[PDB]
DNA sequence: AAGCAGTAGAGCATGC
DNA sequence: GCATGCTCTACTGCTTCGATATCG
């Protein structure tokens, strides 16, 4: 901590005080060399957390001591005599920065909100600046097993912490030391977690702002691609978006030319060509500045050189020039430097690419730039001087103005445009209205309005601060003065309304999306506040006519196009339902044109955006249905939606039979919808009825062949399935089987309609009948085989959900499905999908379903122990995890190069046993032994761990990997039965080993490695260890006590919800 | 010149003081007329912002600064102009704009008060002041020189401006549209065959060959060999065109009158472009440097004095000497004119502001890199700052001068490499340099020669110099570099005419040809290629010398294992022979029989019965050689070219004799028309817009000739993509008629199934009857 | 030897 | 309390000239 209390010359000898401590408390064998890894986290946690007259040093003065500790080490030791003290102050530094990450939990403005962990954001953003200086050199050998486990820990924190502004920068460390080394040249393991994390990083960052837009843009662009090069179209703007957001914060308009390097040299000059004519165009706000800037001086004024060269070149300039290297200019990038580095990438692009930068010689707009915005050139101006007065036309300066007014790249001229267009647009505005007349004394403009509106917006939600501040009244003030009573539906309000529109509808614009929205709250808003609203009859800013103009938005093939309809709904979901009377007639005949919408993004895009804002365009309307019509369900005059039948009332009763006809759509998520506004939906009646009370009775009037006609809707009524399939016959085919197998097991999870009442020999469905083809294709272009994969894993596990629901209700007696489903074969997808996983199509990069999957495994196979059967399941799991299986592969050679194979076919067998044992059902599988009370399969893993540490040479070393196996492999063997004096008396242990000095007692070691499992199982059977732990307290007092410590120091950690286990071992010690 | 001071304070010192009474007036007009004494060319850069400031500051004198909108809805007048002065000394298009509207606005302002006497005066006044502008300006700065040229041409007494400094500064600065209406404005209101000669050496340099047709006559009293020569340059043919130039130059009768000196100026300055779009690096500089001196001319202080010679003569000098030292021999004659030129200042800041490639080119010769790094940064910061100048709807400016970054980062990644030290001892960073040097050229059809001449040149220089400096086989691997380069640039100077550079980059490309396999192929493939493009224009009887001069090398070994392996050089070697043929039979069958008067042996090679198997052999070889393409191709447009090719010519011959009756040429002709239907409905599946409009033919074919060939229809009809037909359904809806409506049928009911609201109004009307 | 001319070193004032 | 920044004064070495001892 006391490094920025020095002198300089000095702190040379202050790191090789720390040197020198630290490599004579390593080199005596491991009993000692664990505070090593303690030192470097408490000095962690000093210096990131440090937010006659002294100072308070923040964070930047040590990083010159953590480049010394292991960079020039070997200049550092050159004296001292150097094997791996840099190697190991590395790996402590990993180990103990995703230790401080690990338990920080974060669930200043950042987003309208604040409520994460109150005071660890200081000590947090110190860490995440901290390790942007020491991370990232020297990512050589000691970084490279170490990717995996530091990517892998951050995106499933992330993933519940989005707006936080910065989780991802360590993401873009580790992803640039991933590509600084190989390693990426498809092992095969971490390439899916990134190439899934990329759609999803795509889609949560779309709503957010400047720091965290710019956070994720740097994460996205540093993604290597020179291997990520499929689907190049899908991140196009997230470059674009780097530039256009570049020239107010340079760091990423760095990036983006650093990106577009590399794009180009090595993605194969195909799929490249055509995504040049919207990359380039962005980039010519670089060329707009031919050095008339003038602002500080541009000479050596007077300085320390400038008096001390003046009277001859003696010694003091040799001691003032080796005195100004020593600067370490690195703040970020000077201006100049980028427009060079544009030009001599322009000129390295090509011959052919390079001449992009423009229009294409005769196109529909080529020919239109040439012509005047308006004929007749009004706003005269006429600049009095003492006696001339001449006229000065405007409109000239207007495409000059509103040009550099928006991309200038360099501020003094910036607010200067942008203070000049404001009081040039309030001139235009004064101007429009006269006294004269109303055709050449009120001269309308509005061929102007139709270029000045499009570039407000652009204006007033730019970026900088001022010209926010300066556009915000002007923008809202104009919204008030055309929406009026005098207007009288007049030609610019039109084009003002195109260009909101037209804004919300548009590509590379997630900052201006939402500022329409709030302009249409304000339209909806002051064009009722004071209108005549006897009079709003005919007029095209209609509420109707706006709706109607959402309608047809909202039903569109065009992705960004629904979009608008999304988020005007969002934007007035708090108008038009605190007003009433024009809710009931139309909006809820939009309910189910937006569910259509909802339908119609089945295909689009994992990346947009579209599913997350149509069910809040539709939530946002079921908190109003249930306020209004409880007391209004009347038959009156009602407005008729898309689909359903003519009448002349449609109260609430045949909407709730079109939600029951449609549940067996493959749209995925407007079937859940569907369902779920049904369930809520058969109450609110007048006479409050049941869904049990309901579905009977109207099947008592309609019968079964009624039900199965929608829930089987077109799906009752195949070899191109025998290699993995891609067209959209089959995925259609399985989407409708996904559909029909998950429509009605909600109606069996509750109590609606029971299991032998539908499944019974009435309905003549091709349910069963189907499902046993489908678990016969089950284990059998790279390109979209994934596209199948995903949805052949996404019924499995629908299946086993059914199953669970079935057989565990009010439905028991199994005697309808004795070989359809619950055959030899749903024993064995329940048996791959337990273990070995990726065998029948389970990626292993995913998240949301890899954690999924061993809940239902669970689920089930207590489902099927206390069933009318279990010989079946018992004798087909007793095939794979005998225990003989487990003794073959515990091998004699689990050191050194058989890194994955022989250390991961293990992981998976322990992973498995560990959920049978959370099933109910470890011993009947695996009974032990005959004689004594101790399993002799846990008595011999335990003596497989033991034994594989002590050396018999050198030393057997360590991982991460050759830990977490070591740790689930020994949690496994203390769930078997009590075996606890076992482990004492492997603990208390006289037996000596060596290293190449001796000092070794081979408990102190085997204590002090795994040393929290070991203490959890201690303090299980509690009252019969305290009293053989005590009882040897003569002849090896040292390690009872260092056993006694290690227990209670952890029963105190855990005080938050173990109080009464302390007291007991207290009242017992 | 201390107005562009780089310290603030003491310029507002000296500004406040220009700014004062008695020493630069307080009258508006007056000030407006004395605001001309003080330009300076030192500062143009800043002479318009200078300008609109002086003439903006005394706009605070006045009463009216009192609410200028007069209601309620409300600003004042200083808010729209200290932004509009403050926006006015930031940018320069901004601030032209400013000043050519105050300027028109007080002379249009001044006609109220004050007669002709003095009217007259001022602007007689201000027209010498404009003329002295544009004479003494060094720097051609764009918004100035442009700014000028448009305030002159709105007013009637300034049009008669200057016809000869006005090119030539519009010219330069890249800003013809302005020169161009200037010009023609003051043609309007004996002939003024000065302003036609400079207008039409305007039109000459933006392309604009259209309009060099009402221009040169003989009624504005010019001559007839200036119109024929510049229709031998309109297509693109500079070695005749400029050929008569000089027969035009050193004439001694002219009996009409004298060729007077503007004319004269003209044919040698096109001249001089002329032999600049070849590669003849000796007569040009011959002609530049040897016109206004004798017996080895100094140079030295020979140019920059008689100020006519600066603005014609420098820049060829420059280029013709400097390309002629960038391969060859040394003849030290340009380093020591530049070192000498430079003592002085207004001949450093012409000589740096304006070329500086030329310069750093000039010092890595003698391996100054260091002075070569100056050069080259000083050359990447003017083109910023020219480039971001020249107006936004100015297109074909932009382009012309955005064609050269490319040589400047070329000469830059070459300054970058050879001077880093993870080089010059592998090379495995050559092989990266050799390989991203090939996948990086200009376009063609596009980008003219000199642009090509350029990026070639320096190349070959900079792989001479790694050579020399790569002490640590690596004299293969460049020269199959070099070769790849130089092969590309005849494929692209072929294709835009340009035959007399082609034909000698050709007899340059070929002694070393001949020592390999992959090599020989293309070269005797590019030079029959660039003999088939060449005779379009001939008329007869040459063209089939010059078909029959490119014979006897197609037919050599080349089957070394090569064309039997190879496909590609299967193919073209087989259609190129096809076309050979295809051109004697028919040059030699529209014009009978006279051919064979200069003809020792073209008569017996014509041979391999006088009239009749002298056509019949080629039209049967043409018929082998292009049979051979298709089913060598069908093993895209690799396979549509030997397609269509085969389809037009079956197609040809078969109207060919549709004209005339025939018995053995009929039956050699009853297999064309199964080879036509077959082989373009299988380009016509493919993506391919060359061969859908030629469907009308296939539906007059199958009628004309229905005896066979039909199920041959029906078959390929039957799998075709059916959107190939909505053009033609109203075609096809008529057929469905009368006979012969099999293989119509079939795609009409594809289309009624599938797309069935495209022919249900073509229906009614052909139902109707 | 005589003149001079240039730099080393110590003490006051400042900063972290 | 430790490192640096700045001036002035006395020490010290160089250059030129003239006298003295030495070696032929």
């Avoid at chain 1, 007349?437 to 000045?452: C, D, F, I, V």
């Avoid at chain 1, 075996?979 to 070794?1000: D, G, K, M, Q």
Wanted: proline share 4%; with cysteine.
């Amino acid at each position: 901590d006391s490094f920025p209390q020095y002198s300089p010359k000095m702190q040379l000898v202050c790191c090789r005080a720390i040197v020198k401590v630290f490599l004579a408390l390593a080199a005596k064998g491991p009993v000692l060399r664990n505070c090593i890894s303690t030192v470097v986290h408490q000095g962690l946690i000093r210096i990131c957390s440090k937010p006659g007259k002294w100072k308070v040093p923040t964070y930047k003065d040590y990083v010159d001591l953590f480049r010394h500790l292991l960079s020039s080490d070997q200049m550092m030791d050159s004296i001292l005599a150097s094997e791996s003290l840099n190697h190991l102050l590395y790996d402590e530094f990993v180990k103990s920065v995703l230790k401080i990450v690990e338990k920080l939990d974060l669930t200043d403005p950042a987003a309208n909100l604040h409520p994460a962990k109150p005071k660890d954001f200081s000590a947090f953003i110190n860490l995440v600046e901290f390790c942007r200086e020491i991370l990232p050199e020297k990512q050589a050998e000691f970084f490279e097993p170490w990717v995996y486990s530091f990517s892998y820990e951050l995106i499933l924190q992330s993933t519940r912490l989005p707006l936080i502004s910065g989780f991802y920068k360590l993401l873009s460390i580790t992803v640039r030391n991933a590509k600084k080394i190989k390693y990426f040249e498809g092992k095969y393991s971490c390439f899916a977690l990134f190439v899934k994390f990329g759609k999803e990083v795509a889609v949560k960052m779309k709503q957010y702002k400047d720091e965290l837009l710019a956070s994720c843009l740097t994460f996205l662009l540093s993604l290597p691609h020179n291997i990520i090069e499929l689907d190049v179209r899908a991140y196009v703007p997230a470059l674009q978006m780097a530039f256009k957001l570049g020239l107010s914060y340079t760091p990423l308009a760095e990036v983006g030319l650093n990106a577009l390097e590399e794009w180009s040299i090595y993605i194969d000059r195909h799929v490249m060509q055509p995504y040049y004519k919207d990359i380039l165009p962005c980039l010519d706000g670089y060329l707009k500045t031919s050095a008339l800037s003038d602002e500080t001086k541009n000479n050596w004024e007077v300085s320390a050189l400038s008096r001390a060269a003046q009277k001859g070149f003696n010694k003091v300039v040799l001691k003032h020039l080796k005195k100004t290297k020593n600067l370490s200019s690195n703040e970020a990038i000077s201006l100049e430097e980028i427009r060079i580095r544009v030009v001599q990438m322009l000129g390295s692009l090509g011959g052919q690419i390079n001449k992009n930068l423009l229009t294409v010689t005769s196109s529909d707009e080529m020919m239109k730039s040439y012509v005047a915005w308006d004929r007749e050139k009004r706003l005269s101006f006429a600049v009095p001087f003492r006696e001339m007065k001449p006229v000065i036309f405007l409109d000239v300066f207007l495409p000059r103005v509103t040009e550099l007014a928006l991309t200038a790249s360099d501020r003094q001229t910036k607010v200067a445009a942008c203070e000049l267009l404001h009081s040039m647009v309030m001139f235009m505005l004064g101007k429009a209205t006269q006294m004269p007349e109303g055709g050449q004394g009120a001269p309308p403009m509005y061929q102007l309005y139709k270029r000045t509106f499009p570039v407000l917006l652009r204006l007033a939600c730019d970026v900088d601060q001022v010209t926010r501040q300066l556009y915000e009244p002007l923008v809202m003030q104009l919204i008030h003065w055309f929406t009026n009573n005098k207007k009288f539906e007049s030609q610019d309000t039109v084009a003002l309304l195109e260009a909101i529109l037209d804004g919300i509808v548009d590509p590379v614009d997630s900052t201006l999306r939402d500022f329409c929205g709030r302009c249409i709250r304000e339209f909806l808003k002051w064009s009722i506040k004071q209108i005549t609203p006897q009079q709003q009859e005919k007029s095209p800013v209609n509420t109707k006519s706006l709706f109607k103009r959402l309608y047809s938005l909202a039903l569109h093939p065009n992705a960004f196009k629904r979009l608008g309809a999304s988020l005007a709904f969002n934007n007035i979901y708090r108008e038009f339902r605190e007003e009433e009377s024009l809710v009931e007639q139309f909006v809820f005949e939009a309910l189910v044109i937006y569910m259509e919408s909802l339908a119609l993004a089945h295909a689009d895009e994992k990346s947009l955006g579209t599913i997350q804002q149509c069910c809040d365009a539709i939530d946002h309307l079921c908190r109003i249905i249930e306020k209004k019509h409880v007391s209004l369900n009347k038959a009156k005059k009602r407005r008729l939606p898309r689909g359903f039948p003519p009448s002349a009332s449609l109260c609430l009763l045949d909407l709730v039979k079109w939600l029951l006809a449609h549940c067996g759509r493959p749209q995925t998520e407007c079937r859940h919808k569907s369902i779920e506004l049904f369930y809520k939906f058969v109450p609110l009646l007048p006479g409050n009825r049941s869904p049990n009370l309901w579905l009977k009775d109207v099947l008592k009037e309609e019968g079964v062949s009624f039900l199965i006609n929608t829930f089987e809707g077109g799906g009752c009524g195949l070899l191109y399935l025998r290699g993995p399939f891609s067209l959209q016959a089959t995925l259609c085919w399985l989407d409708l089987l996904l559909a029909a197998l998950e429509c009605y097991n909600t109606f069996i999870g509750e109590r609606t309609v029971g299991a032998l009442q539908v499944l019974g020999t009435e309905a003549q469905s091709s349910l069963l009948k189907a499902v046993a083809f489908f678990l016969e294709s089950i284990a059998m272009s790279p390109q979209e085989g994934e596209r199948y994969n995903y949805s052949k894993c996404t019924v499995v596990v629908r299946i086993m959900e059914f199953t669970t629901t079935l057989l565990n209700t009010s439905p028991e007696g199994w005697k309808l499905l004795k070989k359809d489903l619950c055959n030899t074969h749903l024993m064995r997808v329940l048996v791959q999908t337990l273990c070995e996983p990726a065998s029948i199509g389970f990626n292993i990069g995913d998240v949301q379903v890899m954690a999924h999957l061993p809940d239902v495994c669970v689920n089930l196979m207590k489902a099927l122990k206390m069933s009318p059967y279990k010989d079946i399941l018992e004798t087909h799991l007793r095939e794979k995890i005998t225990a003989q299986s487990i003794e073959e592969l515990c091998a004699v050679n689990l050191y050194g190069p058989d890194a994955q194979v022989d250390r991961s076919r293990l992981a998976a067998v322990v992973s498995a046993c560990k959920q049978l044992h959370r099933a109910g059902l470890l011993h009947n599988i695996l009974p032990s032994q005959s004689t004594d009370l101790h399993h002799s399969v846990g008595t011999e893993l335990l003596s497989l761990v033991y034994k594989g540490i002590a050396p018999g040479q050198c030393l057997p070393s360590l991982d991460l990997s050759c830990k977490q196996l070591a740790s689930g492999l020994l949690e496994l063997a203390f769930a078997f039965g009590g075996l606890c004096e076992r482990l004492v008396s492997l603990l208390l242990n006289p037996a000596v080993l060596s290293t190449a000095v001796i000092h070794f007692s081979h408990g102190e070691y085997f204590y002090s490695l795994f040393s929290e499992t070991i203490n959890t199982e201690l303090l299980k059977n509690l009252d019969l260890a305290v009293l053989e732990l005590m009882q040897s307290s003569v002849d090896n007092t040292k390690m009872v006590s260092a056993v006694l410590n290690g227990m209670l120091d952890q029963s105190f950690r855990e005080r938050a919800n173990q109080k009464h286990q302390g007291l007991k071992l207290a009242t017992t010690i | 010149q201390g107005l562009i001071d780089e310290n603030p304070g003491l310029q507002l010192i000296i500004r406040n003081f220009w700014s004062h009474e008695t020493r630069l007036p307080s009258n508006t007009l007056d000030r407006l007329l004395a605001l001309n004494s003080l330009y300076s060319p030192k500062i143009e850069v800043h002479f318009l912002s200078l300008a609109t400031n002086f003439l903006l500051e005394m706009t605070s004198m006045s009463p009216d600064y009192p609410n200028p909108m007069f209601e309620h809805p409300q600003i004042k007048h200083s808010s729209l102009i200290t932004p509009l002065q403050a926006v006015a000394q930031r940018d320069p298009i901004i601030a032209k704009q400013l000043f050519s509207s105050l300027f028109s606005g007080i002379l249009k302002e001044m006609d109220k008060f004050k007669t002709l006497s003095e009217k007259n005066n001022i602007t007689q006044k201000l027209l010498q002041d404009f003329n002295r502008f544009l004479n003494t300006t060094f720097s051609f700065f764009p918004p100035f020189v442009s700014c000028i040229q448009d305030i002159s041409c709105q007013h009637a007494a300034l049009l008669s401006l200057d016809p000869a400094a006005v090119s030539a500064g519009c010219l330069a600065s890249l800003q013809q549209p302005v020169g161009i209406r200037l010009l023609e404005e003051a043609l309007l209101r004996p002939p003024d065959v000065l302003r036609w000669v400079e207008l039409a050496k305007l039109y000459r340099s933006i392309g604009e060959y259209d309009v060099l047709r009402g221009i040169f006559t003989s009624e504005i009293g010019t001559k007839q060999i200036t119109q024929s020569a510049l229709l031998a340059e309109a297509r693109s043919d500079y070695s005749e065109a400029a050929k008569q130039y000089d027969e035009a130059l050193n004439k001694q009768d002219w009996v009409d009158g004298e060729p007077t000196e503007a004319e004269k100026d003209f044919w040698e300055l096109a001249s001089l472009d002329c032999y600049n779009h070849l590669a003849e690096w000796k007569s040009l500089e011959y002609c530049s440097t040897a016109s206004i001196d004798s017996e080895n001319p100094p140079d030295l202080n020979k140019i920059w004095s008689e100020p006519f010679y600066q603005e014609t003569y420098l820049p060829y000098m420059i280029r013709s000497k400097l390309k002629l030292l960038l391969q060859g021999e040394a003849d030290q004659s340009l380093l020591t004119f530049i070192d000498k030129a430079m003592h002085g200042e207004l001949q450093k800041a012409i000589l740096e502001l304006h070329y500086s490639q030329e310069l750093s080119l000039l010092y890595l010769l003698q391996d100054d890199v260091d002075r070569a790094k100056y050069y080259i940064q000083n050359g990447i910061q003017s083109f910023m700052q020219n480039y971001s100048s020249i107006d936004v709807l100015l297109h074909q400016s932009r382009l012309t001068k955005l064609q050269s970054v490319q040589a400047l980062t070329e000469i830059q990644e070459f300054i970058s490499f050879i001077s880093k030290q993870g080089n010059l001892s592998s090379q495995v960073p050559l092989k990266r340099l050799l390989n991203t040097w090939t996948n990086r050229y200009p376009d063609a059809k596009m980008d003219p020669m000199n642009i090509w001449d350029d990026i070639i040149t320096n190349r070959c220089f900079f792989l001479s110099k790694i050579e020399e400096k790569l002490t640590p086989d690596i004299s293969s691997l460049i020269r199959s570099c070099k070769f790849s380069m130089k092969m590309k640039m005849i494929d692209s100077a072929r294709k835009q005419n340009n035959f007399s550079l082609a034909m000698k980059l050709l007899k340059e490309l070929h002694k070393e040809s001949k020592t390999r396999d992959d090599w020989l192929v293309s070269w005797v493939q590019s030079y029959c290629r660039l003999s088939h493009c060449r005779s379009r224009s001939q008329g007869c009887s040459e063209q089939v010398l010059t078909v029959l001069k490119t014979v006897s090398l197609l037919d050599e070994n080349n089957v070394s294992s090569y064309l039997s392996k190879n496909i590609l050089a299967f193919r073209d070697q087989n259609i190129l022979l096809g076309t050979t043929y295809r051109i004697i039979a028919n040059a030699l069958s529209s014009e009978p029989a006279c051919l064979a008067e200069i003809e020792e042996d073209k008569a017996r090679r014509i041979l391999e019965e006088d009239s009749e198997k002298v056509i019949a052999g080629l039209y049967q070889r043409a018929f082998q050689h292009l049979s051979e393409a298709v089913q060598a191709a069908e093993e895209a447009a690799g396979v549509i070219d030997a397609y269509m090719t085969l389809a037009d010519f079956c197609d040809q011959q078969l109207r060919k004799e549709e004209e005339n009756a025939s018995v053995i040429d009929s039956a050699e002709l009853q297999a064309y028309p199964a080879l036509v239907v077959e082989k373009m409905l299988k380009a016509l599946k493919l993506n391919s817009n060359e061969a859908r409009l030629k469907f009308p033919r296939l539906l007059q074919i199958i009628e004309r000739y229905p005896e066979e060939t039909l199920s041959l229809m029906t078959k390929e009809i039957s799998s075709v993509p059916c959107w190939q037909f909505i053009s033609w359904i109203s075609h096809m809806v008529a057929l469905l008629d009368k006979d012969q409506a099999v293989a119509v049928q079939h795609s009409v009911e594809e289309i009624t199934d599938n797309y069935p609201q495209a022919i249900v109004y073509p229906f009614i009307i052909s139902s109707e009857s």
